[PDB]
GROMACS .gro file of C-alpha atoms in nm:
model
  173
    1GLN     CA    1  -3.082  -2.862   4.867
    2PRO     CA    2  -3.043  -2.849   4.489
    3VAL     CA    3  -3.142  -2.512   4.343
    4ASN     CA    4  -3.223  -2.407   3.987
    5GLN     CA    5  -2.937  -2.153   3.949
    6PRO     CA    6  -3.091  -1.927   3.679
    7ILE     CA    7  -3.410  -1.872   3.888
    8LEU     CA    8  -3.201  -1.795   4.199
    9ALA     CA    9  -2.987  -1.553   3.994
   10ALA     CA   10  -3.299  -1.379   3.853
   11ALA     CA   11  -3.430  -1.351   4.215
   12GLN     CA   12  -3.093  -1.201   4.334
   13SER     CA   13  -3.098  -0.959   4.039
   14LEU     CA   14  -3.435  -0.818   4.156
   15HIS     CA   15  -3.324  -0.822   4.520
   16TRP     CA   16  -3.010  -0.625   4.439
   17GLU     CA   17  -3.228  -0.355   4.291
   18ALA     CA   18  -3.506  -0.351   4.548
   19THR     CA   19  -3.260  -0.335   4.841
   20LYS     CA   20  -3.121  -0.006   4.706
   21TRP     CA   21  -3.423   0.153   4.884
   22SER     CA   22  -3.616   0.147   5.210
   23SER     CA   23  -3.961  -0.027   5.227
   24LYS     CA   24  -4.073   0.238   5.474
   25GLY     CA   25  -4.347   0.428   5.302
   26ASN     CA   26  -4.260   0.237   4.984
   27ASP     CA   27  -4.489  -0.058   4.903
   28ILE     CA   28  -4.350  -0.110   4.552
   29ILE     CA   29  -4.014  -0.173   4.726
   30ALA     CA   30  -4.184  -0.401   4.990
   31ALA     CA   31  -4.371  -0.608   4.720
   32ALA     CA   32  -4.056  -0.632   4.501
   33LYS     CA   33  -3.852  -0.760   4.803
   34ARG     CA   34  -4.125  -1.015   4.875
   35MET     CA   35  -4.116  -1.128   4.511
   36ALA     CA   36  -3.737  -1.166   4.517
   37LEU     CA   37  -3.762  -1.376   4.835
   38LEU     CA   38  -4.045  -1.592   4.697
   39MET     CA   39  -3.866  -1.639   4.364
   40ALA     CA   40  -3.556  -1.774   4.557
   41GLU     CA   41  -3.793  -2.022   4.725
   42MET     CA   42  -3.922  -2.110   4.378
   43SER     CA   43  -3.570  -2.209   4.259
   44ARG     CA   44  -3.547  -2.456   4.552
   45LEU     CA   45  -3.897  -2.595   4.479
   46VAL     CA   46  -3.854  -2.653   4.101
   47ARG     CA   47  -3.526  -2.836   4.176
   48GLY     CA   48  -3.681  -3.027   4.467
   49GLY     CA   49  -3.828  -3.373   4.404
   50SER     CA   50  -4.121  -3.416   4.646
   51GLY     CA   51  -4.380  -3.205   4.826
   52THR     CA   52  -4.302  -2.945   4.562
   53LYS     CA   53  -4.640  -2.981   4.393
   54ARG     CA   54  -4.846  -2.797   4.654
   55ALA     CA   55  -4.569  -2.553   4.744
   56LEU     CA   56  -4.475  -2.482   4.377
   57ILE     CA   57  -4.839  -2.377   4.305
   58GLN     CA   58  -4.867  -2.167   4.628
   59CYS     CA   59  -4.532  -1.994   4.568
   60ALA     CA   60  -4.650  -1.888   4.217
   61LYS     CA   61  -4.981  -1.766   4.372
   62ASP     CA   62  -4.785  -1.556   4.630
   63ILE     CA   63  -4.561  -1.413   4.357
   64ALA     CA   64  -4.861  -1.324   4.138
   65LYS     CA   65  -5.035  -1.152   4.434
   66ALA     CA   66  -4.716  -0.947   4.505
   67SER     CA   67  -4.697  -0.853   4.133
   68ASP     CA   68  -5.057  -0.717   4.138
   69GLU     CA   69  -4.951  -0.486   4.424
   70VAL     CA   70  -4.646  -0.369   4.215
   71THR     CA   71  -4.867  -0.316   3.905
   72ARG     CA   72  -5.149  -0.138   4.096
   73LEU     CA   73  -4.908   0.107   4.267
   74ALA     CA   74  -4.688   0.172   3.962
   75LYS     CA   75  -5.004   0.264   3.767
   76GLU     CA   76  -5.092   0.533   4.024
   77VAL     CA   77  -4.744   0.685   3.989
   78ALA     CA   78  -4.774   0.701   3.611
   79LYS     CA   79  -5.101   0.886   3.663
   80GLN     CA   80  -4.940   1.146   3.892
   81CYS     CA   81  -4.635   1.189   3.663
   82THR     CA   82  -4.610   1.508   3.452
   83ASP     CA   83  -4.340   1.375   3.212
   84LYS     CA   84  -4.528   1.192   2.930
   85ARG     CA   85  -4.205   1.017   2.822
   86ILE     CA   86  -4.167   0.856   3.171
   87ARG     CA   87  -4.545   0.815   3.227
   88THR     CA   88  -4.580   0.618   2.898
   89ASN     CA   89  -4.270   0.405   2.963
   90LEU     CA   90  -4.380   0.307   3.314
   91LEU     CA   91  -4.734   0.212   3.206
   92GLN     CA   92  -4.647  -0.046   2.941
   93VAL     CA   93  -4.422  -0.231   3.184
   94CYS     CA   94  -4.687  -0.213   3.455
   95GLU     CA   95  -4.939  -0.358   3.210
   96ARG     CA   96  -4.711  -0.646   3.105
   97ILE     CA   97  -4.656  -0.776   3.460
   98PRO     CA   98  -5.012  -0.921   3.512
   99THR     CA   99  -4.971  -1.126   3.188
  100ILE     CA  100  -4.628  -1.256   3.295
  101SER     CA  101  -4.748  -1.348   3.646
  102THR     CA  102  -5.068  -1.514   3.510
  103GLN     CA  103  -4.830  -1.717   3.287
  104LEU     CA  104  -4.616  -1.798   3.600
  105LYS     CA  105  -4.925  -1.959   3.760
  106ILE     CA  106  -5.001  -2.165   3.449
  107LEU     CA  107  -4.641  -2.283   3.398
  108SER     CA  108  -4.590  -2.361   3.772
  109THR     CA  109  -4.907  -2.574   3.775
  110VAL     CA  110  -4.790  -2.747   3.452
  111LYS     CA  111  -4.445  -2.814   3.609
  112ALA     CA  112  -4.610  -2.928   3.941
  113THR     CA  113  -4.851  -3.171   3.775
  114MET     CA  114  -4.559  -3.311   3.575
  115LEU     CA  115  -4.332  -3.410   3.865
  116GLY     CA  116  -4.234  -3.730   4.045
  117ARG     CA  117  -4.419  -3.905   3.765
  118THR     CA  118  -4.224  -4.116   3.515
  119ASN     CA  119  -4.486  -4.098   3.238
  120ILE     CA  120  -4.341  -3.785   3.072
  121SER     CA  121  -3.985  -3.779   2.918
  122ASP     CA  122  -3.677  -3.602   3.054
  123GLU     CA  123  -3.711  -3.373   2.747
  124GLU     CA  124  -4.071  -3.261   2.819
  125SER     CA  125  -3.967  -3.224   3.188
  126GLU     CA  126  -3.664  -3.006   3.112
  127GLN     CA  127  -3.873  -2.804   2.866
  128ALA     CA  128  -4.137  -2.740   3.132
  129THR     CA  129  -3.856  -2.628   3.361
  130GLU     CA  130  -3.707  -2.396   3.094
  131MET     CA  131  -4.046  -2.239   3.017
  132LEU     CA  132  -4.085  -2.166   3.394
  133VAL     CA  133  -3.728  -2.031   3.424
  134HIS     CA  134  -3.779  -1.807   3.121
  135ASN     CA  135  -4.099  -1.663   3.269
  136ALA     CA  136  -3.926  -1.608   3.603
  137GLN     CA  137  -3.637  -1.414   3.436
  138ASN     CA  138  -3.886  -1.200   3.237
  139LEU     CA  139  -4.086  -1.127   3.558
  140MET     CA  140  -3.777  -1.037   3.764
  141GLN     CA  141  -3.659  -0.808   3.484
  142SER     CA  142  -4.001  -0.639   3.443
  143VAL     CA  143  -4.036  -0.561   3.817
  144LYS     CA  144  -3.672  -0.435   3.836
  145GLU     CA  145  -3.743  -0.200   3.537
  146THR     CA  146  -4.072  -0.099   3.710
  147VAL     CA  147  -3.879  -0.014   4.035
  148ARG     CA  148  -3.617   0.195   3.847
  149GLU     CA  149  -3.882   0.385   3.638
  150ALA     CA  150  -4.124   0.434   3.928
  151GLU     CA  151  -3.835   0.611   4.112
  152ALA     CA  152  -3.750   0.818   3.801
  153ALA     CA  153  -4.125   0.910   3.774
  154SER     CA  154  -4.147   1.023   4.140
  155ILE     CA  155  -3.899   1.308   4.068
  156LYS     CA  156  -4.155   1.463   3.829
  157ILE     CA  157  -4.461   1.422   4.050
  158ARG     CA  158  -4.737   1.677   4.009
  159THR     CA  159  -4.669   1.958   4.248
  160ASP     CA  160  -4.843   1.925   4.583
  161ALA     CA  161  -5.079   1.647   4.471
  162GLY     CA  162  -5.199   1.363   4.695
  163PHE     CA  163  -4.932   1.150   4.861
  164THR     CA  164  -4.603   1.025   4.714
  165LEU     CA  165  -4.397   0.707   4.768
  166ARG     CA  166  -4.083   0.764   4.974
  167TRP     CA  167  -3.752   0.692   4.804
  168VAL     CA  168  -3.467   0.674   5.052
  169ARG     CA  169  -3.143   0.508   4.947
  170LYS     CA  170  -2.989   0.276   5.207
  171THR     CA  171  -2.653   0.229   5.034
  172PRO     CA  172  -2.504   0.527   5.219
  173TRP     CA  173  -2.461   0.462   5.593
   0.00000   0.00000   0.00000
């Protein structure tokens, strides 16, 4: 029942952004929603005492897989974008995500191995937790920025080229 509040808040931050749009014809939106949902599960798992070890590692694996989908798709959009200013801005963020999510897998495994066990101090334990939480905030923020910029980039899409990603806002009606 206990939940690591900053991870849950980072997850809700991403969710608030992703749910501004429909997933229909929008994978970036679908993957971002999945990440937000998985990251909320992560806050339960880090704060949960047992059985977390297998689930903590799998949750990080799921989140990293969803991030590769976000990165892969956001890179195509940058490619089809005429505005260099937006194209350049989107690409760096897309590039950073794989590094952050690779780090999520490492830190989740570290936190998972160091659990239940009384060998390590409460200091090393909290630190492992804080490293994980920091990575989670960074990841949530990077995907949120990627969602916002990918939408901004769609406006400038090369005229009549390939297939675009559909941006429909659900806030109205």
